[PDB]
Ligand binder design. Structure first.
Ligand SMILES: NC(=O)C[C@H](N)C(=O)O
Ligand SMILES: [Mg+2]
Lengths: 485, 405, 98
């Protein structure tokens, strides 16, 4: 456990200075998991045996004084909808319980290349659909800052594992806020890079058009590093963007004097609770105390974010989740005696309530008679949403606001009300719709539950994002709080 | 009472790898040994567009006189089946790479220009062998690049349909993008037929004919179906939308299902594939990569090298045959003579011996001789009887066998 | 007005088994969400082109160079029902239960 709280950066150096042995780094991690996850429950399948072996290799390389990797003896937790070859990847679903990938996702490829150490897979909402992670077929992860609250969704495990001192970094996926909102809930740093910034080869899809992998960390700096290790273009993904410059740390430390920060009025709107709103406004003043210029702006189509997002995401899900027939892999119904049954039974028994909700909605929105009025319309609204940003970006460098309308809510408080559950995506979906990069960092606590501050950027400009995020971080953070839980 | 019919034709492109996956397009006899995570539709996999497949798809479309799209994207055609693992076939809906083209055909009457409304890129499905009360599934063929060609509903008879398949097959064959053989499945065809009594706009029943495996066979089902719903229209008939399977043995079409409406495939743009923007330069490269097609090749055999009307059609039936004929021509063979020799003699030799591989057994170099030996050297034909066969499957000069024999 | 019929028709398109006990519950939820979907109706889209892709990349093609498939054994390793090198599935595709 000794280093269970060392930042990626400090731990890295602690390894290169030979003050710690990779094998021990790993021992400390699993000790932490054995002690803490019983209560937090962020982890699914662990890869202890393998992790230990790789770390043993690492000791050698350490002694031979050949340590290559932007990450090196760095433990890493990985969201369970991201393929790990050889390691059981369930998407937290009964449908995939038992499933062992036979190929490797691109980010893991990159991550291994950088010599990071895979500690295990993280719990999530089933097939990334949810806002609390309670839909998991396996366990209900909890908020390290409050054991009665949700850790957010769908990447709950990834936010919780980091906040709980389980791993220095974790990977998540964000379709409409599944990376940022959990981060906001666990008072951790989470980045949903611009669309195309990270390959989707190995990302078990929900919404091809809206999905993306990104890192979660206890500080802005570590986050930037991890993003430099998973970013590049990939022949395995036609939509991976060919942007060579991935130095995201180049400007962390530079001042934001003169930074043009747009604060859309719809982000401090009526659905935002009073505590969250107070924190962000104070956050704005902090930004002003730092040189940046913050003025109100309008993103009028914001209100449509949630509705067009669900229509679009569900529709795609109504297609992306179809490969699950239980024929080639996954849950295969035993009682099926007909092909129709095989399909209908394996899918109905293997999918949870929320997943079937999306599919149902998606199939309908895409069907004959409803296509143009329900799906087509959404795609158009999507254009409206991006337009808003295009305009704002003409005169501003970044956009600021809260990540989620409220602090984390209670266990089971909204698990039975999808309508209220959905509303929590008010400030996050527009980002994915427009394909912009967005980041959440903590900016307060109300009754102990952290509040997230979000920075939305111009396409492919995560470096500015980290720059402003870092500066704000020097004025507020939970850096010393995690250690006390 | 025009019998209105259209044809849906798929062509297998003969590329090295598959359409959206690097797996090879040619497989061995071992099932599910020609696949990868993409073809197997594993969670998290993505499609990667085969560049040559696009070049060949737009090569065949031009040869079909279609307007080539400038913007063309792919779409998902959604449906569940054990042969379609993703549960969606990446195809094209709006913006097919090629639209509004045609081909001229000669049916007993004179010339008729039949329109071809579209041509789009798709991926082939796997094969499902029906064994016992179960089904075996082999994904070896899944993902093989196909192109769908749909005729305008301009065809007007089971014979015009045959003529259509012949010319089409012929033209595609010349572009060298497919062996287009129906016995090998590299060319498939479905027919749609409906009858509308004159004076009015309303049609009788409409049917989709399935399981038509040979040019000759489509006609059979077409003309049978034609008579089948000819009775229905007159006798009493109950108008409806239906799919019908053709029974090869009995020659009849069997009703396999009655459409409840229009099959909902929930088509929508494929987000995993970035759009295609086909520019002029690109269009040129592939424009120029087209030979002289059958029609203009035959019009060349008419006034220049003034050959007959029958001859022209059969010598341009295949590119190899036609090349052979012209290679043998300059060589020193009398145009007509070689014509008569290829028309029958060689053509009948090929069919009788099934030597369809006209490029390995005899050659324009070898055949050129035989015709001169017959032409002026030694005197006349009887002899050509066996000199030809040996000269075709065995040697290189028949002015060495007449001798060595 | 999402009827009992449309529900059962969607389930068929989605290939999801549903019971009358579920169908009703689903007709209601489906509806609720749709009235959540209706919010977009207050958005003005006249003249707005549908957004399919968020980025601008164009013409990303791959060269026609094969790569040997993986071993049949690998391609079958996760399937629950397989007979003689191929995925085994029911096809007593007939009437009370296709
Ligand atoms: N999880 C996300 O990215 C979005 C939304 N909360 C959902 O469950 O779809
Ligand atoms: Mg087709």
């Amino acid at each position: 456990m000794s280093i269970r709280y060392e930042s990626v950066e400090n731990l890295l150096t602690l390894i290169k200075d030979k003050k710690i042995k990779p094998s021990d780094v790993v021992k400390d991690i699993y000790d932490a998991i054995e002690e803490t996850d019983p209560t937090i429950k962020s982890f699914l399948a662990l890869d202890k045996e393998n992790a230990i072996k790789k770390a043993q290799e690492l000791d050698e390389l350490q002694a031979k004084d050949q340590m290559d990797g932007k990450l090196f003896g760095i433990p890493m937790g990985i969201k369970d909808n991201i393929i790990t070859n050889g390691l059981e990847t369930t998407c937290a679903s009964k449908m995939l319980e038992g499933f062992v990938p036979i190929y490797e996702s691109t980010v893991m490829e990159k991550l291994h290349k950088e010599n990071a150490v895979l500690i295990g897979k993280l719990n999530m909402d089933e097939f990334a659909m949810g806002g609390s992670t309670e839909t998991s077929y396996f366990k209900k992860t909890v908020n390290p800052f409050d054991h009665k609250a949700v850790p957010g969704g769908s990447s709950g495990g990834s936010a919780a594992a980091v906040a709980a001192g389980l791993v220095p970094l974790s990977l998540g996926s964000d379709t409409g806020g599944s990376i940022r909102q959990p981060a906001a809930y666990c008072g951790v740093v989470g980045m949903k890079p611009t669309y195309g910034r990270v390959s989707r080869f190995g990302l078990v899809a929900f919404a091809s058009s809206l999905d993306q992998i990104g890192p979660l960390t206890r500080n802005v700096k570590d986050n930037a590093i991890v993003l430099e290790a998973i970013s590049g273009a990939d022949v395995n993904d036609s939509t991976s963007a060919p942007v060579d410059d991935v130095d995201f740390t180049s400007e962390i430390g530079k001042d934001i004097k003169g930074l043009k920060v747009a604060l859309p009025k719809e982000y401090l709107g009526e659905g935002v609770a009073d505590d969250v709103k107070e924190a962000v406004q104070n956050a704005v003043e902090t930004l002003k105390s730092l040189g940046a210029v913050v003025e109100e702006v309008s993103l009028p189509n914001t209100k449509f974010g949630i509705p067009s997002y669900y229509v679009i995401a569900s529709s795609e899900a109504s297609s992306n989740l179809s490969r699950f027939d239980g024929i080639r892999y996954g849950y295969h119904s035993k009682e099926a005696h007909s092909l129709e049954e095989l399909y209908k039974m394996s899918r109905s028994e293997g999918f949870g309530k929320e997943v079937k909700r999306r599919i149902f909605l998606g199939t309908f929105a895409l069907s004959s008679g409803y296509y143009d009025a329900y799906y087509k319309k959404s795609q158009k609204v999507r254009t409206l949403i991006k337009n808003d940003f295009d305009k704002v970006f003409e005169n501003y460098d970044v956009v600021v606001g809260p990540t989620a309308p409220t602090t984390a809510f209670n266990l089971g408080e909204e698990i039975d009300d999808p309508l209220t559950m959905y509303a929590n995506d008010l400030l996050t979906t527009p980002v994915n719709l427009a394909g912009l990069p967005g980041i959440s960092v903590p900016c307060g606590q109300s009754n102990g539950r952290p509040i997230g501050l979000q920075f939305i950027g111009k396409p492919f400009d995560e470096k500015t994002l980290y720059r402003v995020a870092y500066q704000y971080e020097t004025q507020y953070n939970l850096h010393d709080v995690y250690e006390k839980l | 009472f025009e019998t209105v019919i259209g044809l849906e034709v798929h062509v297998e492109l003969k590329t090295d790898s598959k359409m959206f996956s690097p797996s090879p397009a040619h497989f061995g006899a071992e099932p599910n040994s020609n696949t990868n995570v993409i073809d197997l539709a594993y969670p998290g996999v993505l499609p990667v567009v085969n560049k040559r497949a696009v070049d060949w798809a737009m090569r065949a479309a031009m040869a079909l006189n279609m307007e080539i799209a400038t913007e063309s994207k792919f779409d998902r055609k959604n449906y569940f089946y054990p042969d379609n693992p993703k549960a969606y076939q990446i195809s094209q809906f709006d913006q097919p790479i090629g639209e509004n083209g045609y081909i001229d055909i000669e049916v007993d009457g004179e010339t008729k220009r039949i329109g071809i409304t579209r041509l789009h890129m798709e991926e082939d499905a796997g094969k499902s062998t029906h064994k016992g009360e179960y089904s075996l599934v082999d994904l070896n063929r899944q993902g093989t690049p196909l192109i769908e060609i749909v005729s305008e509903p301009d065809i007007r008879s089971p014979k015009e349909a045959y003529a259509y398949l012949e010319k089409l097959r012929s033209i595609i064959q010349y572009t060298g993008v497919s062996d287009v053989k129906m016995e090998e499945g590299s060319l498939r065809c479905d027919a749609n037929i409906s009858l509308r009594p004159y004076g009015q706009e309303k049609f009788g029943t409409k049917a989709e004919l399935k399981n038509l495996n040979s040019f000759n066979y489509v006609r059979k089902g077409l003309e049978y179906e034609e008579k089948r719903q000819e009775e229905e229209l007159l006798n009493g008939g109950e108008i409806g939308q239906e799919t019908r399977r053709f029974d090869e043995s009995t020659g009849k079409t069997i009703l396999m299902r009655v459409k409840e409406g229009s099959d909902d495939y929930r088509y929508f743009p494929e987000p995993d594939i970035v759009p295609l923007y086909i520019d002029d330069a690109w269009k040129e490269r592939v424009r120029q990569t087209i030979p002289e097609l059958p029609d203009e090749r035959k019009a060349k055999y008419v006034n220049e090298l003034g050959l007959p009307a029958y001859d022209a059609h059969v010598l341009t039936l295949t590119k190899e045959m036609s090349d052979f004929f012209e290679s043998t021509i300059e060589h020193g063979a009398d145009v007509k003579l070689t014509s008569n020799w290829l028309m029958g003699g060689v053509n009948e030799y090929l069919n009788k011996n099934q030597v369809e591989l006209l490029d390995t057994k005899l050659t324009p170099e070898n055949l050129a001789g035989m015709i001169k030996l017959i032409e002026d050297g030694t005197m006349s034909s009887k002899i050509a009887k066996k000199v030809f066969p040996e000269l075709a499957a065995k040697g290189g000069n028949a002015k060495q066998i007449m001798e060595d024999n | 007005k999402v009827t009992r019929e449309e529900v059962e028709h969607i389930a068929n398109l989605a290939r999801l088994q549903i019971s009358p006990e579920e169908t009703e519950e689903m007709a209601n939820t489906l509806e609720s969400i749709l009235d959540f979907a209706k919010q977009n109706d207050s958005a003005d889209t006249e003249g707005v082109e549908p957004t399919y892709h968020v980025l601008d990349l164009q013409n990303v093609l791959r060269e026609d160079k094969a790569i040997k498939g993986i071993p049949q054994e690998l391609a079958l390793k996760n399937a629950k029902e397989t007979e003689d090198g191929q995925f085994k599935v029911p096809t007593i595709m007939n009437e009370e239960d296709a």
